[PDB]
Design a protein around this ligand. Structure first.
Ligand code: MG
Ligand code: MG
Ligand code: MG
Ligand code: MG
Ligand code: MG
Ligand code: MG
Ligand code: MG
Ligand code: MG
Ligand code: MG
Ligand code: MG
Ligand code: MG
Ligand code: MG
Ligand code: MG
Ligand code: MG
Ligand code: MG
Ligand code: MG
Ligand code: MG
Ligand code: MG
Ligand code: MG
Ligand code: MG
Ligand code: MG
Ligand code: MG
Ligand code: MG
Ligand code: MG
Ligand code: MG
Ligand code: MG
Ligand code: MG
Ligand code: MG
Ligand code: MG
Ligand code: MG
Ligand code: MG
Ligand code: MG
Ligand code: MG
Ligand code: MG
Ligand code: MG
Ligand code: MG
Ligand code: MG
Ligand code: MG
Ligand code: MG
Ligand code: MG
Ligand code: MG
Ligand code: MG
Ligand code: MG
Ligand code: MG
Ligand code: MG
Ligand code: MG
Ligand code: MG
Ligand code: MG
Ligand code: MG
Ligand code: MG
Ligand code: MG
Ligand code: MG
Ligand code: MG
Ligand code: MG
Ligand code: MG
Ligand code: MG
Ligand code: MG
Ligand code: MG
Ligand code: MG
Ligand code: MG
Ligand code: MG
Ligand code: MG
Ligand code: MG
Ligand code: MG
Ligand code: MG
Ligand code: MG
Ligand code: MG
Ligand code: MG
Ligand code: MG
Ligand code: MG
Ligand code: MG
Ligand code: MG
Ligand code: MG
Ligand code: MG
Ligand code: MG
Lengths: 64, 80, 96, 52
RNA sequence: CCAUAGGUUAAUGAGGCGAACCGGGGGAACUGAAACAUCUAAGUACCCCGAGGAAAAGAAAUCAACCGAGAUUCCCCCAG
RNA sequence: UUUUGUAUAAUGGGUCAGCGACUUAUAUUCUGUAGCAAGGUUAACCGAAUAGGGGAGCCGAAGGGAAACCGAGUCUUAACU
RNA sequence: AGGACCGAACCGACUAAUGUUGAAAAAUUAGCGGAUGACUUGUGGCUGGGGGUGAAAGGCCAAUCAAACCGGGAGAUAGCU
RNA sequence: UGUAACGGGGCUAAACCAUGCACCGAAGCUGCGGCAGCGACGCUUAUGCGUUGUUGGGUAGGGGAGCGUUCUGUAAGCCUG
RNA sequence: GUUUAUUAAAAACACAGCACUGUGCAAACACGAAAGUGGACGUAUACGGUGUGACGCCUGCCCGGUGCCGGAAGGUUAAU
RNA sequence: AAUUCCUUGUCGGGUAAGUUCCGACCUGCACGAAUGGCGUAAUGAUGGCCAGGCUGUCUCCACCCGAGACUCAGUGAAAUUGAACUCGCUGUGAAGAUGCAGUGUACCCGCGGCAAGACGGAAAGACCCCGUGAACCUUUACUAUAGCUUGACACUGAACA
RNA sequence: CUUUAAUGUUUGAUGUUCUAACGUUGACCCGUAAUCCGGGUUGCGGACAGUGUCUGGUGGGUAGUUUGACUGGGGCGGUCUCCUCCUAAAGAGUAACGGAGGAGCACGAAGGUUGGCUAAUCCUGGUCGGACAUCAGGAGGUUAGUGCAAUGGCAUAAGCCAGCUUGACUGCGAGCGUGACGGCGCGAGCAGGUGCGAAAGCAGGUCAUAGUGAUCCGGUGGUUCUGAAUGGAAGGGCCAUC
């Protein structure tokens, strides 16, 4: 049978041009008045998934 | 059976120290020293951070030197 | 994704975005695909007959990719700037 | 943690707000600061409102 | 009281068995979730009823999308 | 065999003969190999039929962005050195 | 007269020894208790498993009981050997 | 439990210190022969042929190359009273 | 008297008796999706449950807690 | 004390001597009045203690009678078992050696006996721990629920105040 | 309007009686040769009761499950995150149920800037006034101070006074540090707009290092980005925030 996609990771990650995965940063959902604006400003943009924890994503997202 | 304790704690190591030594070519913005106080002081082309972190404002080689009447340790970036 | 009982990455991390249904009915077209139609006119029904975009498609852009060497009338499609220049240089006529 | 949290609403008509804390016991009077409003790109008086 | 219930004759039919498939009435838990209760397993196993050589469904108070298609059933895609 | 470590007085086996344990299916990725090559390939089905037909579709040649959208650029931002 | 007395049948099972691959998957020998009573026994019948029954020990329900047996789910699961 | 606190016999050096020359002593090193791996170099590869260095303990484990068995084609062939 | 058939026969269980409490009969209660049945072909001097356990002398204080019974003015409070 | 830790409490009795027994005291760790209190004749295959009789229980065993054991003939098992050419000692060592080292001793093979060792046999330790194992049981653990109960609507209507 | 009368119906509540539903495990008759049942007459009760759906309460009567780890064995006890010093072996890092202490905040000024200032303690003298208030001089030279623990810093003060103020700004960010990762941190500089200062310049919170919590779900404001025939809308997305 077909492999089933882990649908949470499909809602959390997107494949880029060279095969990497982009993702949203954490720590930006609440408790936001005590955090510096520099920190948040460096948390709004999407970041790439690191090389170490990229294998578990590919295992969860076989269909890109 | 019996006993207890009150001395189990300790904190995490903050990884301070000197990251780039003398005669060591750096880029601008490179952290040289992380430290609590001003155990070192900022010389030429070297800024002092919020936490007394010494960073390079320019590119070049690190020069450690002792100046001033108090024999304080200054860090400068030589031109290159 | 099981990391022991540690919270895995796909649950540490937040969800984002939504899915556009309109993106499924849009398509992009090479300039090299313009020669594969017949008649030298390019519509949606022409491209679907040439088996390029697919049936359920309702929108298409032409993109500077590849190159065309023939005058082709483009009708009812969006065109990029470089494709507009290349079509008009090869003799095309972009219309609506 | 008696120092509750509030928001500083722009008086420029925008719904823009800064968030911050105060001790309402020791500072019963309202906070008014002149802060930057990035929508209007001006420094505008913000006033204390409830965090809601 | 008529009547009705009931009774009796007669005629025709049924009853029971049987492998799977089928439609329906009821309907688990182990398990998985690295525990577990929502969830899953699974309308599965099992029980029951009825039928046929197949059954069931079936001829739009349907889809579509402002173009149009034109009952049901089955297969490949759509698409994990 | 398990172990830091067994002649171990740790486990197991009386002996022989026979059987006895990483498979299968479908998806996916990588490597190798072969065919074609900016193209490659068909499934169901038809067909008397491992041919041929069938290109429905799938992957690839363009990406960025949550998205509209733009497009070899795009996003961010009022705008980027 | 008697849930009276002694004591065989009969019912039971307090002690010791034997035996413990037994004669016997609970018995034999020597003693022991009740022995007209809440006795005992024959035949047949009824109560069914989270259920029965129980002068109640978690006792008994076909040499099996803190939930019988058989078949099925079922190749349960086993981060253990 | 039995000498039982040089391994024993035994030793007044066959003990200790110092110095010295010998010799024994390993699967170490060298010699002779043989196999294989990886690199150089040249050939002119049958893509391997000389020379050349050097390497060759090995569990879990990774990689590479093979033997044999049963069955199918080759095979209405070949072997076989 | 009974009891752990198969390591425990006992001080354990039961017992007559005592007390509390429920029950007015289509009884309570119990087995049963229900119909029904037992109670009981009985009717409070009866039946069920609970505790104690012949007989003799006795059974003292506490209702704050937990239960149960009774109350219904007020507060709160569901579907609707 | 079927309850008393300290405790063999103290005193008395009984005995040559009595952590038990009996009777007292009360300082009841931590009795107590129907999860009954204190007494109680009779009974008990009941528990503890004492005495008389009796005796191989014992001092301390002796002899005898029989059934086996032993020998012959016939039939003929079993558990167990890596392989055995299966000594002692001291030491060593997966830390308690038939098997190693050193040394000592010992011709080969049976039979009857004993049972110190083979960490002997039997039963994948019942103790202990672990397992994100199980079962049963409890409760003011969680979530449900039968059952009991409340009210609304329906089956369910008419009058009068 | 405040303060209200007539009539009537729309109607609920509470009684009052009735009978026709319903009940009868009351009597009698018939089916019938029958203590079931049904039908019939009657009596009693009577819209109660009782059943169905909904609903609140009670509910170990029953069922499904949970009931942590470290641990010089387990339990008991203690601990579980963060900060500071030692252990830590002169870079970083480094364990134990090792030795000692703290944190789970505070501040609209205790922030920014400009300007200025410089302590502790003791000695002498001096009204109430005293070991110790305030005052004047001298020694001393930071033995003080730092919002709070410790360590490192601090005189150009980062310590203490006053003035003006909100940079406790928004978008970014070369380049580095630290982590397995998630993530955490430092940061010159650029654009916009601002404060102080004559100006150079400084300011993207506080001398630094603790003062904290992922995701999901959900709430609030803003934004047409999306909007399942179309136009809207709901809902979702994005930004801020709880
Ligand atoms: Mg948010
Ligand atoms: Mg966890
Ligand atoms: Mg096509
Ligand atoms: Mg389940
Ligand atoms: Mg599970
Ligand atoms: Mg039909
Ligand atoms: Mg039409
Ligand atoms: Mg083994
Ligand atoms: Mg072991
Ligand atoms: Mg190992
Ligand atoms: Mg071991
Ligand atoms: Mg060895
Ligand atoms: Mg041995
Ligand atoms: Mg062994
Ligand atoms: Mg073992
Ligand atoms: Mg064995
Ligand atoms: Mg594969
Ligand atoms: Mg290939
Ligand atoms: Mg770019
Ligand atoms: Mg008698
Ligand atoms: Mg006898
Ligand atoms: Mg008798
Ligand atoms: Mg018991
Ligand atoms: Mg039995
Ligand atoms: Mg059962
Ligand atoms: Mg069970
Ligand atoms: Mg199954
Ligand atoms: Mg199995
Ligand atoms: Mg000796
Ligand atoms: Mg010498
Ligand atoms: Mg030599
Ligand atoms: Mg040699
Ligand atoms: Mg060699
Ligand atoms: Mg050689
Ligand atoms: Mg070698
Ligand atoms: Mg090798
Ligand atoms: Mg018996
Ligand atoms: Mg009996
Ligand atoms: Mg017994
Ligand atoms: Mg017995
Ligand atoms: Mg009855
Ligand atoms: Mg009793
Ligand atoms: Mg009393
Ligand atoms: Mg009370
Ligand atoms: Mg009450
Ligand atoms: Mg006591
Ligand atoms: Mg005692
Ligand atoms: Mg005495
Ligand atoms: Mg005695
Ligand atoms: Mg006494
Ligand atoms: Mg008592
Ligand atoms: Mg009492
Ligand atoms: Mg009693
Ligand atoms: Mg008796
Ligand atoms: Mg013989
Ligand atoms: Mg045998
Ligand atoms: Mg030894
Ligand atoms: Mg012998
Ligand atoms: Mg022996
Ligand atoms: Mg013997
Ligand atoms: Mg043994
Ligand atoms: Mg075991
Ligand atoms: Mg339970
Ligand atoms: Mg379960
Ligand atoms: Mg533990
Ligand atoms: Mg311990
Ligand atoms: Mg160090
Ligand atoms: Mg070091
Ligand atoms: Mg300050
Ligand atoms: Mg100044
Ligand atoms: Mg003075
Ligand atoms: Mg501070
Ligand atoms: Mg969750
Ligand atoms: Mg719409
Ligand atoms: Mg729109």
């Amino acid at each position: 049978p077909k492999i089933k996609t882990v649908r949470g990771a499909a809602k959390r990650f997107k494949k880029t041009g060279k095969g990497g995965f982009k993702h949203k940063h954490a720590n930006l959902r609440h408790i936001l008045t005590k955090k510096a604006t520099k920190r948040k400003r460096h948390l709004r943009p999407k970041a790439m998934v690191s090389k170490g924890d990229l294998g578990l994503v590919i295992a969860c997202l076989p269909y890109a | 059976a019996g006993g207890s304790t009150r001395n189990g704690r300790d904190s995490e190591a903050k990884r301070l120290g000197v990251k780039r030594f003398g005669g060591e070519s750096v880029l601008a913005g490179s952290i040289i020293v992380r430290q609590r106080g001003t155990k070192f002081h900022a010389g030429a082309n070297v800024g002092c951070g919020r936490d007394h972190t010494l960073f390079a404002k320019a590119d070049g080689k690190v020069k450690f030197e002792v100046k001033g009447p108090k024999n304080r340790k200054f860090i400068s970036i030589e031109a290159e | 994704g099981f990391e022991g009982g540690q919270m895995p990455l796909y649950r540490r991390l937040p969800k984002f975005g939504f899915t556009s249904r309109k993106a499924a009915i849009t398509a992009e077209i090479r300039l090299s695909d313009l020669a594969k139609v017949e008649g030298g006119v390019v519509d949606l029904n022409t491209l679907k007959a040439a088996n390029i975009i697919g049936i359920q498609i309702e929108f298409a852009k032409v993109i500077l990719a590849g190159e065309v060497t023939t005058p082709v009338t483009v009708r009812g499609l969006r065109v990029t700037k470089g494709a507009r220049a290349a079509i008009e240089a090869a003799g095309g006529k972009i219309e609506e | 943690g008696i120092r509750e949290k509030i928001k500083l609403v722009s008086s420029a008509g925008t719904g823009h707000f800064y968030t911050t804390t105060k001790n309402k016991r020791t500072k019963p009077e309202k906070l008014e600061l002149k802060k930057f409003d990035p929508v209007v790109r001006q420094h505008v008086i913000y006033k204390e409102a409830k965090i809601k």
